[PDB]
Symmetry: C3
Subunit: 228 residues, 3 copies
């Protein structure tokens, strides 16, 4: 339940808060329109994560879900976080490669399904069913990764070489980090429970900070965010 993992929740809260402040201050020295958008998007991501990590730390974002004949602690606040932060991260990537509206909607929509079905799975009372939702959510994730490689990368090359290289790195970072989430879910408290909640929380914290703060540091330090 909500106790051993408190340290990872506290560290997550602190790291997201610090990241938000760093991006906020760093963005003060920016007036370029396009550069503005990237800062706005990128700073909102850890700001949201900060509030949800704090909600979990304080116990608000935690609930008990019956399944497997047991009362299992489930941090639902994560999904509220991801619901808004994952599409924002996708928007950063899309804006970078100047994706068309159609592809953006496809990505945001698939992302919404990924998080929504993940939440349904996390709160499902029938054990076996939890994995059905996991599969559907994973399929949505694969769709997103597909678009990022066969509907994005190809266009990034048709853009400025500075944009292409920054997109390629952020793209690779996204694919590696995002793909780890379903694995942690599958092995953790929400899934088969091979890994305890304490360790599951630690894993998500490392992933979240990297996917948000790490991702943001790479993007906001790049010249790709400016139109030159």
């Amino acid at each position: 339940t909500g106790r051993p993992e408190w340290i990872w929740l506290a560290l997550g809260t602190a790291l997201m808060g610090l990241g938000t402040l760093y991006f906020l201050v760093k963005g003060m020295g920016v007036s370029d329109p396009d550069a503005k958008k990237f800062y706005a998007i990128t700073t909102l991501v850890p700001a949201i994560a900060f509030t949800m990590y704090l909600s979990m730390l304080l116990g608000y974002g935690l609930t008990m879900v019956p399944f497997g004949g047991e009362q299992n602690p489930i941090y639902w606040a994560r999904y509220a976080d991801w619901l808004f932060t994952t599409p924002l991260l996708l928007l950063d990537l899309a804006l970078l490669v100047d994706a068309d509206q159609g592809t953006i909607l496809a990505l945001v929509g698939a992302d919404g399904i990924m998080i929504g079905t993940g939440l349904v799975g996390a709160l499902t009372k029938v054990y076996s069913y939890r994995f059905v939702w996991w599969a559907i959510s994973t399929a949505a994730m694969l769709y997103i990764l597909y678009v990022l490689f066969f509907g994005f990368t190809s266009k990034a090359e048709s853009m400025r070489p500075e944009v292409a290289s920054t997109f390629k790195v952020l793209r690779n970072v996204t694919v590696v980090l995002w793909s780890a989430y379903p694995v942690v879910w599958l092995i953790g408290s929400e899934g088969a429970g091979i890994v305890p909640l304490n360790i599951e929380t630690l894993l998500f914290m490392v992933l979240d900070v990297s996917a948000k703060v790490g991702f943001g540091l790479i993007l906001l330090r790049s010249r790709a965010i400016f139109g030159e």
Copy 2:
């Protein structure tokens, strides 16, 4: 409760899933920007419906609401579905006639009110009050239908004849199908309960598949989605 109607929920799940896959594959042979948008929007609709129909089939999207001195089974997942799919359908229509941002916001906003108030009515514990919400939701629906005829049709004519004819058909399809929803709600388990949940579920399934898959088939088979 959740049993007799299982067959309609299973059929709905299957039909939405098949529709989503068909649109997904069909869209692979498309590269045109504007055509892209229509495929993205139209494929997301049954994809979302698929997840919610499955949630109902598995029992997750079902809840018990006390009213009329009874414990009434209410499938709340429908509203989660409609909250996102109805405005997407409206966006398809709006994009088709190249509606201005102002009208799109008006439609999306009215739609949000329609579904939101429908949900409030569906979960209201005071019988007589349920119909007050039904009336407000219906008023919002009438607003939407009004705009589609006196704020859309008139412009579709000012566009390409291919767009005008496809819009006219989809418009007519929308008006006929959407108008049936409040009637089913009024006579079904959420309303006066003249029709049993089993039959109510069947009716919504026929309406949903037609309004989503049927609607999509007409749109995506049209040349109106391309700019020529």
Copy 3:
């Protein structure tokens, strides 16, 4: 609990409904694209508020929250209202000064955090924690007010003098009214409880009608909404 304050909820419901109808009818005599947007945005605000005020009046938007060792009545419907109406009001201001996408996203995002954290605070079971959320929400509000003065006003001056003057008035109206909300929350039933729910409801009603209907009357009566 839900009784003495019924009159303020009924008055709020009536005033929001009347405002919505007035804006609806007034907007009929408009065809200008940009003018359209302002009417669509501005009419949706009181329309949404109307539904939520009615939900509170009927008892649906009310819930009991345990804290301070007591069962405290909390009208959660307010946050559902504000979640959608505050960013819409910000959009009116942003459209007026032709703000760039980056700033709009920053405002909408900060607003989402403001309302979200306010809701978390309103439903928190640990008394002292409620004020932590209040502080975070207030910080988000201050960010919004900052942008409206150092990221908006400066640009409004670079626009038509009619737009600048209307923005300045609406800006001032927004800053004064919005700043009162955290104070009412802090002194009312959601906070330290120095003011009874009855009076708290009255205060929010006066603020809401002014910030929505009053704000709208000023905007929609202005020539600033037209491009000339």
